[PDB]
Amino acid sequence: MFSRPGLPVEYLQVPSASMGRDIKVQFQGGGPHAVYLLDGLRAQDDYNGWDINTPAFEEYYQSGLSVIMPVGGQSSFYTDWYQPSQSNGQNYTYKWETFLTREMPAWLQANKGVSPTGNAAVGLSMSGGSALILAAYYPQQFPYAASLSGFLNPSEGWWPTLIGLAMNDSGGYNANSMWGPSSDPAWKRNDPMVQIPRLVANNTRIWVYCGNGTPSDLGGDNIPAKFLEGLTLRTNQTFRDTYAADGGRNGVFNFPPNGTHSWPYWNEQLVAMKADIQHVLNG
Numbered sequence: 001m002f003s004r005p006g007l008p009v010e011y012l013q014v015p016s017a018s019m020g021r022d023i024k025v026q027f028q029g030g031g032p033h034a035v036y037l038l039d040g041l042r043a044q045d046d047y048n049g050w051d052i053n054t055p056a057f058e059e060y061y062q063s064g065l066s067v068i069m070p071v072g073g074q075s076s077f078y079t080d081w082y083q084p085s086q087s088n089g090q091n092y093t094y095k096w097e098t099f100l101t102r103e104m105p106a107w108l109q110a111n112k113g114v115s116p117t118g119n120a121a122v123g124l125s126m127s128g129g130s131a132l133i134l135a136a137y138y139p140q141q142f143p144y145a146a147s148l149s150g151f152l153n154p155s156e157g158w159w160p161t162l163i164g165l166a167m168n169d170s171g172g173y174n175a176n177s178m179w180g181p182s183s184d185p186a187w188k189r190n191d192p193m194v195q196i197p198r199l200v201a202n203n204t205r206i207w208v209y210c211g212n213g214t215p216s217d218l219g220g221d222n223i224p225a226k227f228l229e230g231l232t233l234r235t236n237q238t239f240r241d242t243y244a245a246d247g248g249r250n251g252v253f254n255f256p257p258n259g260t261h262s263w264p265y266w267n268e269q270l271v272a273m274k275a276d277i278q279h280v281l282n283g
């Protein structure tokens with residue numbers, strides 16, 4: 001969308017006792033509360049997708065909010081896996097939920113003064129659901145969560161199968177090593193749709209977005225991007241319906257007649273939610 005720098009962006013090495021390795025984290029200070037920008041399915045080990053494809057850091061510079069971009073975790077869904085991925089030779093078990101909710105916040109608090117509470121989890125595609133799940137089980141840390149083109153009903157119908165195929169295509173990861181067979185309780189535990197009651201109880205402020213598959217001049221005009229957005233939109237519409245039916249009253253639902261499963265649109269939403277996050281996290 002556009003690079004950015006001249007800005008105070010740091011590259012940190014945060015030890016993960018649970019994963020037995022150091023996790024690289026891109027960071028821009030600016031306030032005690034932060035926006036956790038989670039990556040997509042094809043998360044790389046060099047830079048977080050938001051920095052690679054958008055002016056995210058530049059857009060939140062001097063916003064009164066710090067920006068945290070963890071790096072890595074391809075096809076991890078930012079969850080704690082049952083075991084190492086039985087397929088691509090992963091020699092350790094992904095424990096990203098533990099990292100994001102315990103190890104990383106403790107590190108940032110001790111060394112930089114970033115508050116472990118009152119933050120926002122923002123995810124897209126793969127991590128859209130993850131952000132909502134984090135808010136569902138860790139309300140103190142995440143009173144705010146945004147899901148951009150997320151897959152909000154992972155345990156339903158063919159989603160477990162499709163997620164498995166996508167994970168295999170992205171680094172050869174195995175969904176079975178993550179949450180087990182589709183019949184395993186882990187699938188429902190991490191299903192935003194199923195956890196709506198928790199988001200209601202917590203009074204989580206949620207920002208849910210999803211395009212309809214029709215590209216605009218912003219780009220992302222390709223079959224995969226168009227089909228994926230159109231498909232998951234159905235899940236997002238049902239999430240919205242269920243949220244309301246369950247008593248939900250603190251959400252923003254953006255379902256415009258455009259947008260594909262691509263970065264330009266996720267960046268547009270990141271900008272649009274800035275004021276919303278500022279007012280919710282900084283009163």
Ligand SMILES: CCCCCCCCS[C@@H]1O[C@H](CO)[C@@H](O)[C@H](O)[C@H]1O
Nearest residue numbers: 040041042043125126151162163166
């Ligand atoms: C059942 C859910 C299947 C999801 C499959 C999504 C395939 C890629 S999507 C999306 O493509 C971008 C490049 O276009 C990447 O940068 C993002 O990381 C990635 O998330």
Ligand SMILES: CCCCCCCCS[C@@H]1O[C@H](CO)[C@@H](O)[C@H](O)[C@H]1O
Nearest residue numbers: 153156157159231234235236238239
């Ligand atoms: C060409 C026909 C393509 C049909 C694609 C269906 C994809 C199913 S998604 C599924 O759709 C339901 C519709 O009711 C929602 O309730 C669910 O939450 C959502 O996950």
